[PDB]
């Protein structure tokens, strides 16, 4: 276990000659971040690199680039010895050559365009025999270091001349390229990629070791998600990482054949995959082969489904073969494929969130040159309901708008090809602002499962409510041992109630942010849709999504909707009966308590709710949320106005004193009304100052050139006289009465145990 | 509130001080209170509106 032996790990940094290590391994090996180290791999091939320090790097493993990884004939999980060299000196001449399949379309000189800023200021240690990669100019091109005069370990100095004379030569046949895809080309699904690595790597990388283990592997993995999430890409990336014999099976290619040809293709596929063990078989569009039994009319398609069921069960031979399959929804599959010894392990590849969308935009904007007007983070914040293929099409559309608008660049290249013209073109922010208007997304109908961003700072006050919520949610997650010691069952649900517009949704999102859990919101229209259409079997489909994303907070907004819509506990003669609430109670009684799924309801009419929900084992906590107090009103007025430029002359603490009895929605209303007044003043000043001043100008330009307004005192002073109270007094008295109907006790406050002798 | 404060100050200052006096008379001889800020500040939290909103709408 000597420390020079290192295991290959993926690096976060994208530099082509920089490796990374941890701090205590480097202190034990006695090295420094200024050192230029040398690596040794298989086939006597080396790579000289610059090492640095890291805290996120693990101790026994080294992080390196995929460029360094493919230039050693070394994959992940292997061993690399390292040798320090202070003998690394400067070079004499540098002779590299291009490679033909990457320069089929590009032309002209590549020296000053690519190679001159590449070796500038980085002090890159190169070696005779390495292949590096240069991105930029809407193309990535690779160069092999062919011949160097000095010793192979050398630092590129600016004094050292670089020779680029020679034909573009072909590669060695054992060399890899960018034709295949690695783990870097996939963003936004780190957890799922980690799970697939855990399932797949340890059996395939070590077949004899895992065979000596004797524990059976998984042999069927079912990827599923919305269309366009990149399931084929993930399968191909894992296949290229493990390096096993990957074979592709496409559904419509089988179903386009004749009767016997489909079975012959399936049998030849599994035979040729069992010859080249270890192997990965990928079956794309599984529902085109094996749909439900009611939908496969005819004999031949049921025969093909039975052939697949035969071969999956006959695969159990300990033959080191893993079968993956992708589909668009888990419901359309024939349920015989869900059994044990078959496709039983299921991985959910959902739609990506904002950090994921930012990573997708960073992946797709590597080669394209980019003007500094753009901010990809704001683009990722504005794209809502966008799968990664939508983002790739959006980058495509912005690039085509940028090439279209430069019709003088169409004139600049009528039929001649210049690399410098594509080098001379970048993409503005207004191209992306245009491309967001002609973008038709495909995931607005999907339920959003993500961690909220609302903190406790956006909510004013409610300190005992905050304490009781964190006691009910956070403590069984962090400290289960106390609940094992004292021996109680942790509670399962909470019902909020109160007047409208007082921050119940914000409290749910805040506790979901505090505990770092996923959040699933279900509004009133969805429950009413299930009630009108009588489609109450979708509730189990909701609770399954809640189980797949554990730990989670499941929030049912407006739980009194069907009871209000039915008769208001008055019409139709019935009392507190519902299809949908019945199915919710059944699913609450069904679920286990180990999964840490926490359910929250919220009403405005707590009298007309079904009393069978309030039993123990169900939503049994009742929390009253009143109108906000004065400090809470201060914090609400602060939290609403963080986006707006507010003048410092404005007194919010005086503003909270007048508004006795408002809700949160009234304060947001008056803030947005003051903002409307400011926008009207700015526009009607700018139109007059620009147009009405002079048509033919006296000066050369506008002498002012100054936007006048910000939000100031007279805007609030004017917008105050339109504000009104939303909640009357009798409504508040009703909530106080219902709060007193659940009163603590009478006469048990003075209970004491007797103290005698 | 002011009358209650004045009476419960005067009873304590006269009777509770000394039964057999040290000085010849009361050394203070001064009525302490008038109506001031804390009396309104305390009596505010008992005030209520007599006329609701629906009545005004009528
Ligand atoms: N998360 C992602 N990371 C990287 N590329 C992505 C991502 N999502 C989509 N893409 C790209 O968008 C396209 C999606 O291709 P596919 O792998 O076919 O997606 P898909 O989920 O397989 O769609 P189906 O179901 O096969 S029709 C490819 O060009 C991908 O490179
Ligand atoms: N503690 C709070 N801090 C700031 N704003 C709040 C707070 N509570 C409620 N609000 C305001 O209420 C609005 C949302 O109310 P919501 O949670 O939808 O009420 P309901 O659940 O009754 O519909 C937000 O626009 C927010 O400004
Ligand atoms: Mg596919």
Distance between CA A143 and CA A139 in Å, rounded? 13
Contact flag A728-B54 (C-beta cutoff 8 Å) = yes
Chain-chain contact of A728 with B49 (C-beta, under 8 angstroms):
no
Regarding the beta carbon of A727 and ligand 2, being less than 6 Å apart is answered no
Q: Distance of CA A592 to CAs A312, A587, A617, A647, Å?
A: 32, 10, 11, 54
| Feature table: binding site of A for ATP | 227-233, 328, 364, 501-506
Q: Cβ contacts (< 8 Å) between A730 and chain B: which residues?
A: 52, 54
Task: State the DSSP code for A336.
Answer: G
Can you list the alpha helix ranges (DSSP code H) found in A331-387? 354-364, 376-382
Is the Cβ–Cβ distance between A443 and A387 less than 8 Å? yes
Interface with chain A: mutation pick from B52, B55, B57, highest number of A CBs within 10 Å: B52
In A604-698, beta strands by DSSP E: 619-624
* Listed residue (A738, A667, A727) closest to A499, CA to CA: A727
Q: Is A292 helix (H, G, I), strand (E, B) or coil?
A: coil
Structure tokens at B23: 């000085």
Which helix H or strand E contains A497, and what residues bound it?
strand A493-497
**Which residues sit opposite A262 in a β-bridge?**
none
Half-sphere exposure of residue A171: CA atoms within 13 angstroms, side-chain side: 17
Burial class from Cβ neighbours inside 10 Å (0-12, 13-18, 19+) for residue A446 reads middle
Domains of chain A: 93-178 (3.10.330.10), 190-348 (3.40.50.300), 354-438 (1.10.8.60), 449-624 (3.40.50.300), 630-735 (6.10.20.150)
Q: In this structure, what is the dihedral angle of CA atoms A691, A697, A701, A703, given to the nearest 10 degrees?
A: -80
Supply A64's token pair. 């390196």
Q: Which of A283, A388, A390 to mutate to test the pocket of ligand 1 (most atoms within 8 A of CB)?
A: A388
CA of A284 to the centre of ligand 3 (A): 5
Q: Do A650 and A713 form a contact (C-beta atoms < 8 A)? A: yes
Count of other CB atoms within 10 angstroms of residue A619: 24
Ligand nearest to the CA of A355: 1
Nearest to A401 by CA among A431, A436, A370: A431
Q: How far, rounded to the nearest angstrom, does the alpha carbon of residue A37 sit from its chain's CA centroid?
A: 36
Nearest Cα residue to A140 out of A361, A372, A363: A363
Distances from the Cα of A476 to the Cα of A480, A483, A508, A591, A601, angstroms: 5, 7, 17, 17, 20
- What is the rounded distance in angstroms from the CA atom of residue A250 to the CA atom of residue A266? 11
Inter-residue contact A54 to A21 (CB < 8 Å) = yes
- Ligand 2 atom closest to Cα of residue A602: 21
- Distance, in Å, from the CA atom of A285 to the CA atom of A327, rounded to the nearest integer, reads 5
Residue B46 to residue B36: CA distance in whole angstroms: 17
Give the whole-angstrom CA distance, residue B4 versus residue B32: 12
A580 CB less than 6 Å from ligand 2?
no
Residues 6+ apart with CB under 8 A from A108: A417, A418, A419, A420
With b for 16 or more beta-carbon neighbours within 10 A and e for fewer, the B19-56 pattern comes to eeeeeeeeeeeeeeeeeeeeeeeeeeeeeeeeeeeeee
Q: Which of B32, B40, B31 is nearest to B1 (CA)?
A: B40
Contact present, A166 and A147 (Cβ < 8 Å) = no
CB-facing half-sphere around the CA of B8: CA atoms within 13 A: 5
Does the CB atom of residue A509 touch ligand 2 within 6 A?
Answer: no
The Cα–Cα gap between A388 and A396 comes to 12
Give the list of residues 6+ apart from residue A313 with CB closer than 8 angstroms, or none: A341, A342
Report which DSSP code applies to A160: S
Q: In a mutational test of the pocket of ligand 1, which residue from A188, A230, A330, A394 has the highest number of ligand atoms less than 8 Å from its CB?
A: A230
Å resolution of this model?
A: 3.2
State the Cα–Cα distance between residues A38 and A151, nearest whole angstrom.
Answer: 13
Strand A79-84, strand A140-148: pairing? unpaired
| Chain A environment of B54 (Cβ under 8 Å) | 728, 730
A602 C-beta neighbours (distance < 10 Å), count = 21
Rounded to 5, what percent of chain A is helix, strand, coil? 40, 15, 40
Q: Under 8 Å CB-to-CB from A379, ≥6 apart: which residues?
A: A361, A432, A436
Q: How far apart are CA A635 and CA A660, in angstroms?
A: 15
Pocket test of ligand 2: the residue of A501, A555, A633, A659 to mutate, having most ligand atoms within 8 Å of its CB, is: A501
3-state secondary structure A430-486: HHHHHHCCCCCCCCCCCCCCECCCCCHHHCCCCHHHHHHHHHHHHHHHHCHHHHHHH
What the block records as the tokens of A756 is: 């005698």
Helices marked H in A90-165 = 116-118
The rounded distance, in Å, linking the Cα atoms of A184 and A66 is 9
Q: What DSSP designation does A99 have?
A: B
Binding-site residues on chain A for chain B (CB distance < 8 A): 725, 728-730
The pairing of beta strand A154-155 with beta strand A89-90:
parallel
Count CB-CB contacts under 10 A for residue A496: 26
CA distance A229 to A238: 16
Dist CA B27 CA B20 (whole Å): 14
User: How many A×B Cβ pairs under 8 Å?
Assistant: 9
Residues 6+ apart with CB under 8 A from A205: A77, A242
Q: Which of A346, A295, A298 is nearest to A325 (CA)?
A: A346
CA dist list (Å): A605 to A260, A560, A568, A610, A645: 65, 7, 10, 11, 38
Q: If you measure from the C-alpha of residue A232 to the centroid of ligand 1, how many angstroms do you get, rounded to a whole number?
A: 7
User: Which residues are A53's β-sheet partners?
Assistant: A21
User: Exposed e or buried b for every residue in A179-198, given b needs 16+ CB within 10 A?
Assistant: eebbeebbbbbeebbeebee
Is residue A655 within 8 A of residue A479, CB to CB? The reply is no
Residue A48, judged by CB atoms within 10 A of its CB (0-12, 13-18, 19+), counts as buried
Q: Cβ contact (<8 Å) for A728 and B52? A: yes
Please identify, by atom number, the ligand 1 atom nearest to the C-alpha of residue A389.
Answer: 12
Which residues are CB-neighbours of B45 under 8 A, at least 6 positions away?
none
Which SS3 state, helix, strand or coil, does residue A139 take?
coil
For A725, which residue in chain B has the nearest alpha carbon? B53
Could you tell me which residues are beta bridge partners of residue A619?
A493
DSSP class of residue A169 equals: B
CA A490 to chain CA mean position, Å: 31
Alpha carbons A364 and A620: distance in angstroms, whole number: 50
- The DSSP bridge pattern shows strands A140-148 and A18-22 to be unpaired
| Greatest C-alpha distance within chain A | 109
Report which secondary-structure segment, H or E, holds A682: helix A664-687
Strand partners, A135: A140
The residue nearest atom 7 of ligand 2, judged by CA position, is A503
Location of structure tokens 């069952």: A489
Q: Report CA(A188)–ligand 1 centroid distance (Å).
A: 12
Q: What 3-state class would DSSP assign to A209? A: helix
A255-279 core/surface letters (b: 16 or more CB in 10 A; e: else): eeeeeeebbeebeebbeebeeeebb
H helix or E strand, kind and range, residue A668: helix A664-687
Q: Indicate the SS3 state at residue A585.
A: helix
Phi/psi at A588 (5° precision) = -70, -40
Q: Hey, CA dihedral for A690, A693, A696, A702, is it positive or negative? A: negative
Question: Parallel, antiparallel, or unpaired for β A93-98 and A140-148?
Answer: antiparallel
CA distance A728 to chain B (A): 7
Distance CA A544, CA A329 (A): 13
From residue A549, how far is each of A296, A466, A552, A599 by CA, in Å? 33, 24, 6, 14
Ligand nearest to the CA of A232: 1
Residues whose CB falls within 8 Å of the CB of residue A106, separated by 6 or more in sequence, listed in order: A137, A139, A141, A419
Owner of token pair 């040809």: A261
């Amino acid at each position: 276990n000597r420390p020079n032996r290192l295991i290959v790990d993926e690096a976060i940094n994208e530099d082509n000659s920089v490796v990374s290590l941890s701090q205590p391994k480097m202190d034990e090996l006695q090295l420094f971040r200024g050192d230029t180290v040398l690596l040794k791999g298989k086939k006597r091939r080396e790579a000289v690199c610059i090492v640095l320090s890291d805290d996120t790097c693990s101790d026994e493993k080294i992080r390196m680039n995929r460029v360094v990884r493919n230039n050693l004939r070394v994959r992940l999980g292997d061993v690399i010895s390292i040798q320090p060299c202070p003998d690394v000196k400067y070079g004499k001449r540098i002779h590299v050559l291009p490679i033909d399949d990457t320069v089929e379309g590009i032309t002209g000189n590549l020296f000053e365009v690519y190679l001159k800023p590449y070796f500038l200021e980085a002090y890159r240690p190169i070696r005779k025999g390495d292949i590096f990669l240069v991105r930029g100019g809407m193309r990535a091109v690779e160069f092999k270091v062919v011949e160097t005069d000095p010793s192979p370990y050398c630092i590129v100095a600016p004094d050292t001349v670089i020779h680029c004379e020679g034909e573009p030569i072909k590669r060695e046949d054992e060399e890899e390229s960018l034709n295949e895809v690695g783990y870097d080309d996939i963003g936004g699904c780190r957890k799922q990629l980690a799970q697939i690595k855990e399932m797949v790597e340890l059996p395939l990388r070590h077949p004899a070791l895992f065979k000596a283990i004797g524990v059976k592997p998984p042999r069927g993995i079912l990827l599923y998600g919305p269309p366009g999430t990149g399931k084929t890409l993930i399968a191909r990336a894992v296949a290229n990482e493990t390096g096993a014999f990957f074979f592709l099976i496409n559904g419509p290619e089988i179903m386009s054949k004749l009767a016997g040809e489909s079975e012959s293709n399936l049998r030849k596929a599994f035979e040729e995959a069992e010859k080249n063990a270890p192997a990965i078989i990928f079956i794309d569009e599984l529902d085109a082969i094996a749909p439900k039994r009611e939908k496969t009319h005819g004999e031949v398609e049921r025969r093909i489904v039975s052939q697949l069921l035969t071969l999956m069960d006959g695969l159990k031979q300990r033959a080191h073969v893993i079968v993956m399959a992708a589909t668009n929804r888990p419901n359309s599959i024939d349920p015989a494929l869900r059994r044990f010894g078959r496709f039983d392990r299921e991985v959910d590849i959902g739609i990506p969130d904002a950090t994921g969308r930012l990573e997708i935009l960073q992946i797709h904007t590597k080669n394209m040159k980019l003007a500094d007007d753009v901010d990809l983070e704001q683009v990722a914040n504005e794209t809502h309901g966008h799968v990664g293929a939508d983002l790739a099409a959006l980058c495509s559309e912005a690039a085509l708008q940028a090439i279209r608008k430069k019709m003088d660049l169409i004139d600049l290249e009528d039929e001649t090809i210049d690399a410098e013209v594509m080098n001379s073109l970048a993409v503005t922010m207004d191209d992306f602002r245009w491309a967001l208007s002609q973008s038709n997304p495909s995931a607005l109908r999907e339920t959003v499962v993500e961690v909220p961003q609302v903190t406790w700072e956006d909510i004013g006050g409610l300190e005992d409510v905050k304490r009781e919520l964190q006691e009910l949610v956070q403590y069984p997650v962090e400290h289960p041992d106390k609940f094992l010691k004292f021996g109680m069952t942790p509670s399962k649900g909470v019902l909020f109630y109160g007047p409208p517009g007082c921050g119940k949704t914000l409290l749910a999102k805040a506790i979901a942010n505090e505990c770092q859990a996923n959040f699933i919101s279900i509004k009133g229209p969805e429950l009413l849709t299930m009630w009108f259409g009588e489609s109450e079997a979708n509730v189990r489909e909701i609770f399954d999504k809640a189980r797949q994303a554990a730990p989670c907070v499941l929030f049912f907004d407006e739980l009194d909707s069907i009871a209000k819509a039915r008769g208001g506990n008055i019409g139709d003669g019935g009392g507190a009966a519902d299809r949908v609430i019945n199915q919710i109670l059944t699913e609450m009684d069904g679920m286990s308590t180990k999964k840490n799924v926490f359910i929250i309801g919220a009403t405005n009419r707590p009298d007309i709710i079904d009393p069978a929900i309030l039993r123990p084992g169900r939503l049994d906590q009742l929390i009253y949320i009143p109108l906000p107090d004065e400090k809470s009103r201060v914090a609400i007025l602060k939290a609403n106005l963080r986006k707006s430029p507010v003048a410092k002359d404005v007194d919010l603490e005086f503003l909270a004193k007048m508004t006795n009895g408002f809700s949160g929605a009234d304060l947001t209303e008056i803030c947005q009304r003051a903002c409307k007044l400011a926008i009207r003043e700015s526009i009607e000043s700018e139109i007059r100052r620009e147009r009405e001043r002079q048509t033919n100008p006296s000066a050369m330009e506008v002498e002012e050139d100054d936007p006048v307004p910000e939000i100031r005192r007279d805007h609030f002073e004017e917008a105050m006289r339109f504000a009104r109270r939303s909640v009357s007094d009798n409504d508040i008295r009703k909530y106080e009465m219902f709060a007193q109907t659940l009163q603590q006790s009478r006469g048990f406050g003075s209970f004491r145990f007797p103290s005698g002798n």
